[PDB]
Design a protein around this ligand. Structure first.
Ligand SMILES: Nc1ncnc2c1ncn2[C@@H]1O[C@H](COP(=O)(O)OP(=O)(O)OP(=O)(O)O)[C@@H](O)[C@H]1O
Ligand SMILES: Nc1ncnc2c1ncn2[C@@H]1O[C@H](COP(=O)(O)OP(=O)(O)OP(=O)(O)O)[C@@H](O)[C@H]1O
Ligand SMILES: [Mg+2]
Ligand SMILES: [Mg+2]
Lengths: 551, 551
């Protein structure tokens, strides 16, 4: 195994400017059980958060050390953290969640059956058998109780067996017997494997307290006692405070922490020097990536079973296509002005809808993305590829259904080849718009601040598309080459009306209008290549934005 | 005070089809303390919700009675329910939240100072003085700890002094001293005022257990013991179960609840018949409404001061206006085709933006709206008026800033009268679009499907705006009068270019074009009246949708 020793010296926290912690010092060796006790608001989820490395900035003072070294990402890979909040996927069951975690983080030198057995044994040990076939749920949908979600979160980190384990009040919400059994399991995990377990209990009983190895006492940002658990009562008796009647020691510790100045001075004069002196190949990556991508795809699809399946989308897009076809019923080839508006409207529709839809993806899952990123479940590239692969399963269906009706109701230029070319061009444009929407949604954390920005950006793209204005100023004409709607409209008009040499045949001012609204100054291959470039670049920018966010 | 006798008889709950509760009978008299004890997953919280009237449907059997009568809304007005989850406004402080509650619910016959004193005394009693000047926060922003949020939620209902008080594990997350103080406060509130208090503790100490009047024991959906707390040990000693060593009685109760069949049979044979036999002016409303509206407005603006105060919105709207003005730089009055498109684009912009920005208002606050509505803090009409009044403070600024630049960069028809008329028309149109967006967002409380539905509806409105198609089918002409963009565009063109008599001096095919795209078949007054009608109707439909949702 990998031993870990943990040290924190003169750690103080200042944010008004109030002090949350000050003058806390201590260590925990491997194979030692650490408790962080204190009254409510004394500071118990901030020391552990800083211990786990989840806190940064200039508000942190003192020195924190792991193996006489600074906190590193490789060290953080072996750290398990169980916080108070239960950030769980609502549409999965307990079995699926724990099996996914076990497949993801267990070593890749064992068969599937061994990992499944490990997950099942972990489920059975924690007493989760009864509700192992139920939806986890969340605050909105009806799922499991609050006492089982804590055990699920416990098993989320216990499945991997991290060398360093930090728990943030894991016994809150369970009865005496269940909490005692969980504490006994933690004690067996700490003593029987030489690991480093730090926990912050709040309401411990005498039986639970008796098996605790070391206890730290915090009183509103000040340390009061540290060392062996059995010596707390003796030390406080020697300092001048004695129980009037026999009672549980932890209650006395909390009462003393809840007079305070004398205890602080006595501790600072007695235990300060003793504590201050005692302290001094390549194919494997490919295989793992593909397996992880498969697992992520399965999880994403399982989540999307009850969300992505929406008959309303098809029943509305079909109605919109029928309305569009009826409005342009059998318009002939002669009126080029009437049929040029239909292509621009199609471009507006399929540049507005996917871009607006794609902005809701990353911010929706932001709540659990940080939680899964902090532990180090998988590299962000696998998640990005999983998302882009999952989206395309449903996204591409709508434009096909739209065109299948619109192209034949309006009776555009007959031919299978123009049909296929137009469909491919429209799908590429939709992909580019979705990529732009995803990038803009990833750039800004909130899902609603980015909504207005996306709306204004795509409306500016529509304005620059070239259909509205004709007398563009000479010095402000370059913006036409940036908008994604321009290339799609040019490709559609070039496909439908060729190069314009045919149009002048029937027509024999009109020639200038046809020349300016048909030929243009951009080629087909250039338009396709630039569309592909935009589709690559938007995903690249979204990946960079996702890389930027790290706590 | 108003006494309440609470009864539940043969309450069973069945949802796979797995039973959560079955054979639960009992009663609590005024001035009596009720406990719901049991292991994790025993269904105590479901029973607590059922007794509080928060559960409906055919899944509930048995009979529930209050004062020998069914649960009514007037009775629900006297009930204070606190659950495990803490639904609090993240951008408010403790003082502001509790003061708002005290002003909203305390009787309208006392001075402001008395209510403020009640709030301050409640704050001081619960030990919240130290952090009473901090932001409450949520999972995203840094606020108060999890141990103080529970006390805030407890005070949220303690400020009212309801006759019936139901608590769902209120002591989870606090130390021994804080838990003891809260339990003593609850005991004094129950015995000293003749109230009806039902709670479900999970990890009680002997001292806490000794002051509990009555205790009910649940074992995975089955009752095990009910009656006085002091007789809990004697009954199980008589039935044939005795602890080997002296220990806390609640631990023994949980162990027995955690063998089970014999206890169930003994309880069904012994204590069943005994319990079964024991079971058997006008101006005031106006004055209050305006004050409630004032408080709601203050809370809304306090919340929006940290979110709606975005300079990006103006910095982007002014940029879009500058781009629009540069695109149409000093276009003369001769080209009607180049100038009608600008008005249509303005209509598209100011229909798309507010409608899409008004779809997330209600779903965002849905999380707390149900919690506030269940208690009965205020009528829905006050909340609706508060929301519509708060929105207009910020919404109306954007169109004015847009027009101030666009109308004079393009140099439209000079004159203060056309400027004011078109500004009023644009403001009415943006209000109507915002109303439509609000109604659609209220109809479906999800922010995912509503966005797509609103986008498709607005795109259909744009298509039916009348700028794209010219050969409309005879049987496809009525829905022109349904879209709001049609009225907005007609008003804009009528204001800018008059009745068309003016255009024909220069006009002299073109005459038909001017007649069809200038005069139309709808009047100015009709357009304004129909716009006002739509503005009223959308808010009416939104109010109906908000009224519909009741758990
Ligand atoms: N719709 C459902 N279908 C199936 N099982 C359900 C359903 N809703 C709840 N359950 C299960 O029924 C049991 C009832 O739990 P409940 O929500 O009443 O919490 P509780 O008993 O108060 O527990 P705790 O003390 O651990 O918070 C749980 O095991 C829960 O997972
Ligand atoms: N940014 C901040 N500014 C001011 N005060 C803060 C800030 N963040 C936290 N606090 C306060 O500092 C104190 C430290 O609380 P902390 O987050 O450590 O919880 P805790 O002691 O583990 O709580 P509990 O044991 O009651 O669950 C709390 O009173 C909290 O409200
Ligand atoms: Mg904490
Ligand atoms: Mg519960």
């Amino acid at each position: 195994c990998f031993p870990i020793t943990l040290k924190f010296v003169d750690v103080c926290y200042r944010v008004e400017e109030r002090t949350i912690l000050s003058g806390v010092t201590g260590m925990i060796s491997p194979g030692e059980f650490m408790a962080v006790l204190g009254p409510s608001g004394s500071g118990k989820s901030t020391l552990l958060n800083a211990v786990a490395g989840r806190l940064h900035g200039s508000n942190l003072t003192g020195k924190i050390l792991i193996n006489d070294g600074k906190i590193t990402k490789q060290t953080l890979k072996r750290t398990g953290f169980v916080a108070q909040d239960d950030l769980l996927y609502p549409h999965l069951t307990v079995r699926e969640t724990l099996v996914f975690v076990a497949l993801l983080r267990l070593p890749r030198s064992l068969t599937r059956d061994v990992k499944l057995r490990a997950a099942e044994s972990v489920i059975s040990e924690l007493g989760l058998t009864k509700c192992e076939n139920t939806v986890v749920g969340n605050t909105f949908i009806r799922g499991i109780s609050g006492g089982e979600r804590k055990r699920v979160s416990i098993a989320h980190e216990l499945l991997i067996n991290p060398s360093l384990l930090v728990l943030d009040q894991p016994t809150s919400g369970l009865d005496a017997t269940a909490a005692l059994r969980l504490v006994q399991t933690l004690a067996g995990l700490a003593h029987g494997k030489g690991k480093t377990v730090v926990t912050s209990i709040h309401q411990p009983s005498s039986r639970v307290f008796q098996m605790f190895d070391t206890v730290l006492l915090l009183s509103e940002g000040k340390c009061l006692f540290v060392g062996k658990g059995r010596d707390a009562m003796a030390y406080f008796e020697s300092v001048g405070f004695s129980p009037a009647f026999p009672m549980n020691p932890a209650d006395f510790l909390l009462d003393l922490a809840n007079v305070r100045q004398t205890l602080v001075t006595a501790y600072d004069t007695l235990l300060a020097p003793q504590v201050k002196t005692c302290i001094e190949g390549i194919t494997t990556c490919i295989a793992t990536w593909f397996s992880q991508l498969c697992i992520l795809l399965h999880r994403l699809l399982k989540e999307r079973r009850h969300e992505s399946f929406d008959l309303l989308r098809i029943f509305q897009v079909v109605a919109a296509s029928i309305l569009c076809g009826l409005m342009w019923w059998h318009s002939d080839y002669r009126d080029v002005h009437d049929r040029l508006g239909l292509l621009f409207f199609i471009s507006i529709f399929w540049g507005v809808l996917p871009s607006f839809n794609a902005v809701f993806t990353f911010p929706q899952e932001r709540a659990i993305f940080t939680r899964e990123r902090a532990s180090g479940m998988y590299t962000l590239s696998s998640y990005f590829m999983a998302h882009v692969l999952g989206s395309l399963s449903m996204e591409l269906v709508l434009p096909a259904s739209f065109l299948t009706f619109t192209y034949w109701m309006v009776y555009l230029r007959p031919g299978i080849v123009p049909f296929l070319l137009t469909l491919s061009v429209l799908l590429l444009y939709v992909l580019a718009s979705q990529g732009l929407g995803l990038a803009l949604g990833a750039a800004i954390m909130d899902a609603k601040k980015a909504s207005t920005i996306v709306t204004v950006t795509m409306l500016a793209f529509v304005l620059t598309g070239g259909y509205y204005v004709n007398k563009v100023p000479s010095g402000m004409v370059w913006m036409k080459y940036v908008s994604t709607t321009f290339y799609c409209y040019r490709l559609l008009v070039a496909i439908q009306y060729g190069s314009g040499e045919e149009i002048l045949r029937m027509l024999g001012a009109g020639c200038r209008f046809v020349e300016e609204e048909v030929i243009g100054d951009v080629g087909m291959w250039t338009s396709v290549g630039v569309l592909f470039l935009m589709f690559f670049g938007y995903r690249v920018l979204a990946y960079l934005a996702l890389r930027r966010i790290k706590h």
